[PDB]
Amino acid sequence: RGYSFSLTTFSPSGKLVQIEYALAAVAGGAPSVGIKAANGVVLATEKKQKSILYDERSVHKVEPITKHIGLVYSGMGPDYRVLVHRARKLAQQYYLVYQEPIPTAQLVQRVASVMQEYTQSGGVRPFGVSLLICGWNEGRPYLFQSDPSGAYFAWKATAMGKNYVNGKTFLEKRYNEDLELEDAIHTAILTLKESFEGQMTEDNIEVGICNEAGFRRLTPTEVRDYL
Amino acid sequence: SYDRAITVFSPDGHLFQVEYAQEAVKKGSTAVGVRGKDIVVLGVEKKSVAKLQDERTVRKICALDDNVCMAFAGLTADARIVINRARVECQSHRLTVEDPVTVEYITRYIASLKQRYTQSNGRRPFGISALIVGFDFDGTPRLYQTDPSGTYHAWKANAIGRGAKSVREFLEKNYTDDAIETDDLTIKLVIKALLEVVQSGGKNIELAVMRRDQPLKILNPEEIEKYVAEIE
Amino acid sequence: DRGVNTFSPEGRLFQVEYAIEAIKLGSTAIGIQTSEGVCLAVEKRITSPLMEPSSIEKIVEIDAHIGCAMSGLIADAKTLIDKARVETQNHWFTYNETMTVESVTQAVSNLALQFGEEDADPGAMSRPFGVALLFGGVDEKGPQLFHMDPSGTFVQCDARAIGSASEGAQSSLQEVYHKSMTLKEAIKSSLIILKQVMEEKLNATNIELATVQPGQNFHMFTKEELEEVIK
Amino acid sequence: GSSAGFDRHITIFSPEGRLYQVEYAFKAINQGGLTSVAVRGKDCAVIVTQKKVPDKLLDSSTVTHLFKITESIGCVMTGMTADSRSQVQRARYEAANWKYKYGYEIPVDMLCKRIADISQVYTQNAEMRPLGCCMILIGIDEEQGPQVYKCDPAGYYCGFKATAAGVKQTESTSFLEKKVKKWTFEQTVETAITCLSTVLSIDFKPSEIEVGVVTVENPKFRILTEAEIDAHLVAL
Amino acid sequence: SRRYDSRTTIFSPEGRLYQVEYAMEAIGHAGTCLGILANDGVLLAAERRNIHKLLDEVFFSEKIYKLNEDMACSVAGITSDANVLTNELRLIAQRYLLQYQEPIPCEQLVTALCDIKQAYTQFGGKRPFGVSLLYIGWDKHYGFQLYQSDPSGNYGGWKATCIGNNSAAAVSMLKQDYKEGEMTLKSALALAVKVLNKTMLSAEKVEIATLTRESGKTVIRVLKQKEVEQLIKKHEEEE
Amino acid sequence: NQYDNDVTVWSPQGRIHQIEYAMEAVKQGSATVGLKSKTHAVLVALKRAQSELAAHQKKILHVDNHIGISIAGLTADARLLCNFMRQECLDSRFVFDRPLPVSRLVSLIGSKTQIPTQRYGRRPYGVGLLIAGYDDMGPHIFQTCPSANYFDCRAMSIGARSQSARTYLERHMSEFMECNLDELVKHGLRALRETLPAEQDLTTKNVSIGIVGKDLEFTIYDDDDVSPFLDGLE
Amino acid sequence: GYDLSASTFSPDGRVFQVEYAMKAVENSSTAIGIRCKDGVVFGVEKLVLSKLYEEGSNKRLFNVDRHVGMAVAGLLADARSLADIAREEASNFRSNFGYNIPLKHLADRVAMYVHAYTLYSAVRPFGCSFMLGSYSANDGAQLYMIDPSGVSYGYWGCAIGKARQAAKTEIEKLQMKEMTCRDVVKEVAKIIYIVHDEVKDKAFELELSWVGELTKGRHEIVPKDIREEAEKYAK
Amino acid sequence: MEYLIGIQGPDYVLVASDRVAASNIVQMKDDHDKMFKMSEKILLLCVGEAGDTVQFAEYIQKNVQLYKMRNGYELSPTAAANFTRRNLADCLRSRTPYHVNLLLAGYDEHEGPALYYMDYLAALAKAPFAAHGYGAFLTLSILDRYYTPTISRERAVELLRKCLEELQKRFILNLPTFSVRVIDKDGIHNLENIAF
Amino acid sequence: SIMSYNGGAVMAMKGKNCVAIAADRRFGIQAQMVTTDFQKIFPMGDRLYIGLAGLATDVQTVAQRLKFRLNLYELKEGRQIKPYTLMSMVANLLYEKRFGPYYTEPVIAGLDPKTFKPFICSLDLIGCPMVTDDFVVSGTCSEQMYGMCESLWEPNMDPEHLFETISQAMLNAVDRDAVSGMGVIVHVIEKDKITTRTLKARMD
C-alpha cells in the first residue's frame, strides 16, 4: 500500500529535522568542487573506492544530463541515480515540447521541485544528496547547487561533502572572476587536494567540464596530465 | 490518500476532536445575534483592530444569499471554506427550485457538512460556529446557530465566541418584547450586548443589519458612534 | 493507541462500548406499545429561554405509518433518519406497498457497524453512531415498537426508555404497563414517568409526544393537545 | 551512534544522517551462514559458492545458490533465501523485458544497475523493508569481455575484478586483494576456490561447493558438474 | 502504519493546530519582508539572506516573484515551499485569465491560494506549507493593494506590513510612521529603508520592488544597485 | 501489552491475541445446540432478553430451503455473514439450478472470514455460527468461529456455559443416528436446558427451534409452534 | 520494539515477526512426507480436540491439483487459504500453457506468494508450513516443503510441526529410494505413532495420502483397507 | 424558428425576442420569455435546441450570480460573454454539446453598452446590432440601411418596429408578439411588448 | 469542409529586416456575414504575431490557449519567447488533439529577440511546422494567395516595399474568394516599430 502521511514534519522551533538530517548525510559524503570560469564550468569529485578490487571505470559520479548539462553530487550514491534519471527525463520532456535544449536554470528548477516533493509527501524521506549542476546555454556558463530541501542557489565556485567549509574558504581566496576554463581545473583539483588524505591519482578523482562545445567527462589521460 | 480516523469515541463516550473544535470557537471574536420583528441584526467584535489594515478584507459577517447572511467565531480559514460551500448551495437551490432558500434550509446544510467532518476518515472537524440570520418568503425573521459538532437550533438572541456566556446572560435578562419593538431599538440591543465584553466599545464593534426585502447593510463607524452616544 | 476495529479482552469493540456510553448523556425518550397505536415521548431539555424549543426535533417522521424517537448525539441521527426515509420510499417505488416497521429498523441497523480506517472509501464512517433510536409504527401486524443502539442490535419491546435517566424510567414502566392498556392510558403513563425523571417542571413546551395509530398516520401532539393531558 | 524518533524502525534519516534499517539488512546477509566468491579472469568469470547440507533428507540438487538469469548471465545470491529467490525472479523478468523492448540481450552492468534501482526504492519508502540479500552477476560483454557485478541491499552497485559476500566477506576480500596486486580459465577458478578454502579453513571436497563460469569462448552460463569441479580440486 | 503517523491535521486540547503553529515559528526566522501601500503604487522591501562572496546574481531577483501582468509577491519561510506556492499562484492567474479574458483581481488570487493552504491543515495527513506571502498589485475594482498570507491559510489586506525576522519590531515602527492616505511612492521608499535598517544596511543586502501605473499599464520593477544605494545614503543624512 | 492491538501482529508465543479476543464474543452469547440424526438436523437456540417488556432476540435465521444457521456473538456481524451466505446460495441456484452443498458453502465462509485476520486495520468476525443443512450427503451440522475455522460435527453447542450442554451431548451422541425427529429435538432441548441456571427453565418464549430434513424444508418454530416439542420433558 | 512489524529488521538482522509465525507451526501436530522410488506418502496425525467432531473433520491434507497433494501444519485457517492459492496457480497454468504444472514450479510460485507477506506492515506472514507431493511420468516423484518465510526446498523425507526433530530421526533409518509406495505407507504410519504423545495429547486420527505410479500419478487418500492395516502394524 | 435581435446605442442596448413556444405545428405558448437576467445590467437571450437553451442559460446564470456573491461585485459584460463562450466551446467536443445560439447584452459603467453575438460553435463577436433565427435574414438588411452609431433610444425602438413589421409581412412563420428590453446605466428596463 | 465555414485568410511575408502579416476581417457563418472586424492576428510578444485561419471558434480557442501557455512560459524562464520556440509550442498544442484536432491553420511571423532576424512559418491542423524563406499563406483562398506571392515577392524588400507587396497580394487574392474579404488588416513588424494599417478593400 504505502503510508499517506508526511514523514517530515515541523518541530516546535520550526525546523524540518528530516531535511536537516539529510544535510548531515550530504556533509559526510565524498567532497565535490564546482568552479565557473569565464569560458566554462568545471566539476570535480573524489571518486576513491580505496580497496583495489573495485572497477574504477564502471561507476561514475559525474554524469551528463544532456549535451550541455553535467551533474555531480555529494551524499548517498543510490539516491543520486534516481535524481539523475529524473533529470534526464525532465530534460527530454522539455525538449519534446520546445524542440530546444533545456536551459540550465530551467532544469535545476524542475529537478529541485522533485526534491521538495519528497519532503512533504506521504511515506517518504528527503533525498540524502546535494547536487552540483553545471551547464552552458546562450553563450554563458552556469553553476547551480540543489540541496535536499529543494532549494537551489547559483554559485561561481563552491564545494560540498566532507570538509566543505574548509574548501569554501580556500575557494573564496583563490578564485578570480577573469579565470579561464583550463586554469579553472587547476584550482578545482587543488581545492580537492586539501582534504584527500592519501595520494591523488588519475583513478582517484573524476572531472567533468562544461563549455561552448558541450558537457564532457575528462578521461583518465587528461586528468593524469593535469595532476 | 489519508484514511485515518481522527474523531473517535473515548472511555466516557466523548468525542475529543469535536470538543477541541469547540475550544477554538471560544477563543474567537464574540459574535452577537438578535432577532427583531422587521429586522435581524448581527454584531461582531473586532479584536485585532489595527489601523494599518483594510477592514473590508477581514469581516466576520458575510452574505450567502440575498435573504440570508451569517457571522462566525473560531478559525477564520475554516469559516471561509464553510461560507463558500454554503454559497454554492444557495445558487444550487435557486436552480432546482424557483424560490430562494429558507434560512433553516441553508442552516441545515451548513450543520450537516460540519457533522460530516466529525465522522469521516482523514479529516478533522471545523473549528467555527455560525449565526445564520435572514428572512423567509413569508417575511418571518429567522436566527439559527450551528456549531462544530453539527447541531443547530433556532434562537431569539444568541452570542458565540469568547465571553459568549456573559453576553448570553445579558440578553436573557434584557431581551423582552419591548427591546426589539423598533428598528433602532433592536440595533441598540445588539450594541449594548457587545459593550460588556469589549474594551472601549464604539470603535471596535462592527455590526450589520438586515431589514425585510433588502440586502445586507453594514453600518459604518460613524453610524455606530451615533448609537453609542444614545447609550450614554 | 488502538484502531477503531479493535476487540477488547472481554470480546467487545472498544469504539462501540464508548458509543453506548455516549447515549447515557442524551435526553430520555419513553416509548409504549399498545394495541391501539404506539406512543413516543421525549424530553426536549432546553438550556436557555432565548433558545426556541420548536427547533428541537427529537421525534421525526420516517413515513406515514412510522415514527422515530432518538437519544444521544442528535447530529449523528440525521444520517440514520435519512437512510430510513429513503429506504421506505424505495420500498414503495419497487413494490407499491408500505414497508414494515421491523424492515425499516433492519435497514438502519446495517449501517451501525459499517465503519473503519483501513480498506475504506472516501465516504466511509470513521466511527460508530453514538445514538439510540426508538422506532414506532403500524403495519400488517399492528402497533410495533423497536429499539436500535450503536452496536447494531435491533430488538422489539412493549415499553422502552433510552437516555440519561433510562435505568430509572425503565423500572417505572415494568410495573405500570400491561398488555390491555389503552393508547390514551399509555400517553399519561409516559408523561407521568417523564415528569418524574426530568429536572425541569414538565410543561407543554418542554416535552414532545407523538403517536401512530392503526387507521391514522404519524401524528405529533401540538401545544393544545399536550396541555390537555398535562392537566 | 545517536538516534531519535523511529529511525531504527523505518528507513528515515537519523541525527548523524544514516539509515539504521538499511544497515540492519546487511547483518541479515550474514544470517544465512555462507560465503560467495567471484573472480574475474582474462577471458572468463568464475562464481564459487558454499553448498551446505544440514539434513541428509534434503534433496541436495534443489539446494543451490547459483541461478541462470539469461543465456549468458548467471548469478549467485547470498543472505535471506526467500529474499534471494524474489530478487532472482525480478532479475529474470527485467532481463527478459529488456530484450523484448530493445531487441538485444541486456548487458551485465545494465541489469545490475536496474536491480539496484529497485533496491533503492525500499530504502526511501517506509512501508516496506529492504531485502536482506546480495547479488553477484557474471556475464560476458561483447565489447568489454568478462564482467563481474554486485549490488547490495542499500541500492549501491559496482563493477569488480574479484568480489566476496557473506559471513567471511572481509576475509575473502583481504585475500583477493593481495592476489590481484601480483589469469586463465583454470587460474581464475583455482584462485576462487583457494580464497574460499583458505578463509573458511575447510579444504572442500567435491560435493561441498558450486562453481559457475562464463568464458569468452563459450559465453553461455554453466554450472560445473561433480566430475568437473573435482578436477580443479585435485589440482592443488 | 498508525504508529508512525504524526497526525498533522489534528486539533489539540487548547483547540489549536500544532503543525500550523510550528510553521509560523519558522517564518519568524526568515528574511524580513515588508510591504507599503502608497497613492501611486505599492512596494516590497525584502532583506536578502542569501549573501556570500561566491554567490552568483544570475536571476532577476531572489525573493520577489511575478505572478502575472499586474501582480507580484514576496515570500518568507521555506524556500522550496514558495517555489511550489508561487508556481501555483501563476497557474491560478492564468486559469482565470483564460476563463474571463481579463486579469484576475488581487483579492481573488490571494483567496484561491489560501484555500489550498487551509486544505493542508484539515485533511490529507501532510505537513502544512511553511511560508508566508506578501502580495502587491493593481486591479480595476480597488486599485493598488497589499495582502499578507500565513501557513494556516489566513489572509488580510493592509496599508503597511512586515513578515519575517523582526515583524513585531518593524510593525511598531510602521505604526508610528505611516501617514495613512497621504503617502507617495517616493516617500514610502524612505519609510521602507528607514524601517529596514532599524530592523537589521548595504545595497546588496536588500532588494526593493515597486508597482506603479503608467499609461493604463502596470509596471513592476526591481530597483537597481545604484538606485537603492542613493536611498540608503539619504537615510543616513537624517540619522 | 503491545501484541494485542492488531490482527497482523504475531505474538512471541505464536498466537494472535485479536483472534482470541474475538472468540470471547461467541462465549458471551446465549447457548445454541446443534445435533443431527440420519435424516434430520436440529438447531435449538436459547433466546435472551434484557428488559421484561423487551422481546427475545432471534438466534435462528433462514439462509435457504436446505440451510439454516444459529448465531452466537455479534448481532451485526451475524447479519453481515448471513447476507453473504444467502447471496452465495442464490448464485448457486441461478447458475447451476441446484442447492449449494452445505460443505461447499462452509468453505466460502471460511475464506471470507480469513482475509480480515491477515490484513492491517481489519478485525475478525466476532460471531460463531452453527449451520444446519441437508443435501445429497445427508444432514450436516457445521460450526464456524471468529478465527476462520470450521468443524464437521455430529453435535455441537456454542455460547455462554455451553460446556454443560456439550458434556450432555458427548454422552448421548451414540443414540442420535437411529432416532426420530421428535426424540432428536428433545435430545437437543435437554442439552440446551443444561446450560441454563438451576432455577429458571426452558419456556415457550425463550427457546427457538430450527429443523431441516430429507422431506422437510428448513422451518423455524418460535412461540406457539414449539409447545409440541416442549411437551414431553421433565 | 523491533518485532511488531514484518517491514522492520532488528539490530542483529532478523525479522522477528516471521520468526514468530514459525512458532505457530511448531505448536501444531506433526505431519511427515516420504518420497520413494515411485511416489510420495503423506502422513498427518490429526489431533481430535473433541468427541463431538465427525471422523474426518478438520483435514490437513488437500489436493491442490489432480497430480499434486498438500499436507499442512500450523494455523488451519491460513493453510486453507494457501491451498486455494495453490489451486489457482495450478489451474491458471493449465489454461495458459496447456498442461499440468510441474511440482518444482508450483512450489516456487506458491513460495513467492508466501514471501510477499513478510515484507510489509499492511499484512502479516502466514503462520503455517506445508509440503507438496506429486508424481509425473516425465518428472518422477517430487516432494517440496515451504515454511512461513517463503522458503521452498526439495526433500526425500520431510516432517513439520511439534515433533519434527524426533520424526526426522525415524525417517532417516528408511531407504526411501529403493523402497516402494505400499511398503512406505506402513513405515509412514509407524513413525506417526512413535512421535505422537499419548500423555500430553489425547485422541488422534491418522491421515494418509499418496501419489505415484500405483495411483497412476493421481493424488488421493490412502484406501481405507490399506490405512486400517497400516494402523494395526504401527500399534 | 425563434427570433432574437439586439441594437446597441450610444449609452444603451435594445434587445427584443419572439415569445412563441411551439411543438410541431402548434404554438403552445404566446407569451414565452427567452431573456435571462444574468445580473443587474446583463441580459442573455437564448434560442436553439428544445432542452439545451434552458439548461445552458440557467447554468451560466447560476455561475454569474455566484460570482457576485463571493466577490461583492458583478462580472462585466465582456467577462460574462467570455465566460459563456468558454463554457459553450468546452462542451462542443464533449459528450453533450448544447446546440444554442445567443445574444449577450450588457452595460458596463466604464465601457458603456455591449452587444455580443454567439452561434452554436462558440464564436464570440462584438457587434453594433445582431439577430438570430430565420428572421435575421429578412431584418439584417433593414438594420444595415437605417442604423447609425449615434442612434437615439426613441429611433432605436422605431427601427425595431420596422424589422418586426417586415417579419409580419414577409416571414412564413407566425410571430405576433415580441418581448422588448433596454439596458443602460440604471439597469434593465421592461418595454411594452410589440404586438400585431 | 469545416474549414470553409467561417472563411478568412492569413498571409505572412519576409523582408530585409522586417516581416508583414495580413489577414481578412470578415467573420461570417457560411454565406452570411456577421461582423467585419473579426480578429485573426494576435500579438504573441512585441515582435511576434500569430495569424489564425479556419473555424472561428477554434481560432479564438487556440489563440487563448496559446496565450495561456505563453504567459506561463515567459514567467517561468523570465525571457521573451523566440519565434522558432513559439512554433514548436504551437505545433505541440495542435498535435495533442491528433484525433480530434482544432480546425485552424496558424501562420507565425516575427523578428527573433535580440538578433532581429525575420521569421515566418505555417502549421497545419495537427501541428506540422513549415519554415519558409519567402511567404506563408493560410485560408480558404490559398491558391489565389499562392499565385500572387509567387510573382510579386522579391528577395530583399524594405518595410515600404514589403507593405505594398503583401497588400497587393491579399487585395487581389480575397477578391477571387466569396467567403473572404470585407477589409484587410496588415501588420509590418520592424526592429523598432509596428505599423498597422487597414487597407481599403471591396465590401462584397
UniProtKB/Swiss-Prot annotation, chain A:
Family named by the database record: Belongs to the peptidase T1A family.
Subunit (UniProt): The 26S proteasome consists of a 20S proteasome core and two 19S regulatory subunits. The 20S proteasome core is a barrel-shaped complex made of 28 subunits that are arranged in four stacked rings. The two outer rings are each formed by seven alpha subunits, and the two inner rings are formed by seven beta subunits. The proteolytic activity is exerted by three beta-subunits PSMB5, PSMB6 and PSMB7.
Any Pfam family matching the protein: Proteasome_A_N
Residue positions where Phosphotyrosine is found in the record: 3, 21, 73, 118
Q: Where in the cell is it found?
A: Cytoplasm; Nucleus
Looking up InterPro entries in the UniProt record yields: Ntn_hydrolases_N (IPR029055), Proteasome_alpha (IPR050115), Proteasome_alpha-type (IPR023332), Proteasome_asu_N (IPR000426), Proteasome_sua/b (IPR001353)
Q: What does this protein do?
A: Component of the 20S core proteasome complex involved in the proteolytic degradation of most intracellular proteins. This complex plays numerous essential roles within the cell by associating with different regulatory particles. Associated with two 19S regulatory particles, forms the 26S proteasome and thus participates in the ATP-dependent degradation of ubiquitinated proteins.
- The organism named in the record is Mus musculus (Mouse)
Keyword Magnesium in the entry? The reply is no
- Tissues in which the protein is found: Detected in liver (at protein level).
In the record, biological process GO terms are:
response to virus; ubiquitin-dependent protein catabolic process
What is this protein's name? Proteasome subunit alpha type-2
UniProt keywords, alphabetically: Acetylation, Cytoplasm, Nucleus, Phosphoprotein, Proteasome
Among SMART domains, the record links this protein to: Proteasome_A_N
- Positions carrying N6-acetyllysine: 67, 168
From Swiss-Prot, chain C:
Q: Which residues are glycosylated?
A: 190
> Which Gene3D superfamilies would you find in this protein's record?
Glutamine Phosphoribosylpyrophosphate, subunit 1, domain 1 (3.60.20.10)
Entry keyword Lipoprotein:
no
Q: In which tissues is it expressed?
A: Detected in liver (at protein level).
One Gene Ontology term of the biological-process aspect is: proteasome-mediated ubiquitin-dependent protein catabolic process
Task: Please give the PROSITE patterns that the UniProt record associates with this protein.
Answer: PROTEASOME_ALPHA_1, PROTEASOME_ALPHA_2
Q: Which CDD domains match?
A: proteasome_alpha_type_5
Cellular component (GO) terms are: cytosol; nucleoplasm; proteasome core complex; proteasome core complex, alpha-subunit complex
The UniProt keywords, alphabetically, are:
Acetylation, Cytoplasm, Glycoprotein, Nucleus, Phosphoprotein, Proteasome
Give residue numbers for the modification (Phosphothreonine).
Answer: 47
- Check the record and name the SUPFAM superfamilies matching this protein: N-terminal nucleophile aminohydrolases (Ntn hydrolases)
Pfam families listed in its UniProt record: Proteasome, Proteasome_A_N
Q: Please, which domain of life does this record's source organism belong to?
A: Eukaryota
Q: In which compartments does the protein localize?
A: Cytoplasm; Nucleus
- Phosphoserine modification, residue list: 8, 48, 55
User: Its biological function?
Assistant: Component of the 20S core proteasome complex involved in the proteolytic degradation of most intracellular proteins. This complex plays numerous essential roles within the cell by associating with different regulatory particles. Associated with two 19S regulatory particles, forms the 26S proteasome and thus participates in the ATP-dependent degradation of ubiquitinated proteins.
- Family annotation (NCBIfam families): PRK03996.1
In which family does this protein belong, per the annotation?
Belongs to the peptidase T1A family.
What's the protein here called? Proteasome subunit alpha type-5
* Source organism per UniProt: Mus musculus (Mouse)
Q: Which gene encodes it?
A: Psma5
Swiss-Prot record, chain G:
Quick one: a GO biological-process term for this protein? proteasome-mediated ubiquitin-dependent protein catabolic process
| GO CC terms of this entry | cytosol; nucleoplasm; proteasome core complex; proteasome core complex, alpha-subunit complex
One Pfam family hit: Proteasome_A_N
CDD domains named among the record's database cross-references = proteasome_alpha_type_3 (cd03751)
SUPFAM superfamilies the UniProt entry points to: N-terminal nucleophile aminohydrolases (Ntn hydrolases)
Task: Output the InterPro entries linked to this UniProt entry.
Answer: Ntn_hydrolases_N (IPR029055), Proteasome_alpha (IPR050115), Proteasome_alpha-type (IPR023332), Proteasome_asu_N (IPR000426), Proteasome_sua/b (IPR001353)
Residues that bear N6-acetyllysine: 51, 200, 224
Keywords, alphabetical: Acetylation, Cytoplasm, Nucleus, Phosphoprotein, Proteasome
Gene3D superfamilies in the record: Glutamine Phosphoribosylpyrophosphate, subunit 1, domain 1
GO MF annotation, one: ubiquitin protein ligase binding
Q: What does this protein do?
A: Component of the 20S core proteasome complex involved in the proteolytic degradation of most intracellular proteins. This complex plays numerous essential roles within the cell by associating with different regulatory particles. Associated with two 19S regulatory particles, forms the 26S proteasome and thus participates in the ATP-dependent degradation of ubiquitinated proteins.
User: What name does this protein carry?
Assistant: Proteasome subunit alpha type-3
Q: Which organism is it from?
A: Mus musculus
Q: What is this protein's gene name?
A: Psma3
From Swiss-Prot, chain I:
Pfam families referenced in this protein's UniProt entry, alphabetically: Proteasome (PF00227)
- Name of the featured protein: Proteasome subunit beta type-3
Tissue localization of expression is: Detected in liver (at protein level).
Tell me where in this chain the PTM N-acetylserine is found. 1
Protein location: Cytoplasm; Nucleus
Per the entry, what this protein does is: Non-catalytic component of the 20S core proteasome complex involved in the proteolytic degradation of most intracellular proteins. This complex plays numerous essential roles within the cell by associating with different regulatory particles. Associated with two 19S regulatory particles, forms the 26S proteasome and thus participates in the ATP-dependent degradation of ubiquitinated proteins.
Family affiliation: Belongs to the peptidase T1B family.
Q: Which GO terms describe its molecular function?
A: endopeptidase activity
Assembly description: The 26S proteasome consists of a 20S proteasome core and two 19S regulatory subunits. The 20S proteasome core is a barrel-shaped complex made of 28 subunits that are arranged in four stacked rings. The two outer rings are each formed by seven alpha subunits, and the two inner rings are formed by seven beta subunits. The proteolytic activity is exerted by three beta-subunits PSMB5, PSMB6 and PSMB7.
Sorted UniProt keywords: Acetylation, Cytoplasm, Nucleus, Proteasome
GO CC annotation: cytosol; nucleoplasm; proteasome core complex; proteasome core complex, beta-subunit complex
Listed SUPFAM superfamilies? N-terminal nucleophile aminohydrolases (Ntn hydrolases)
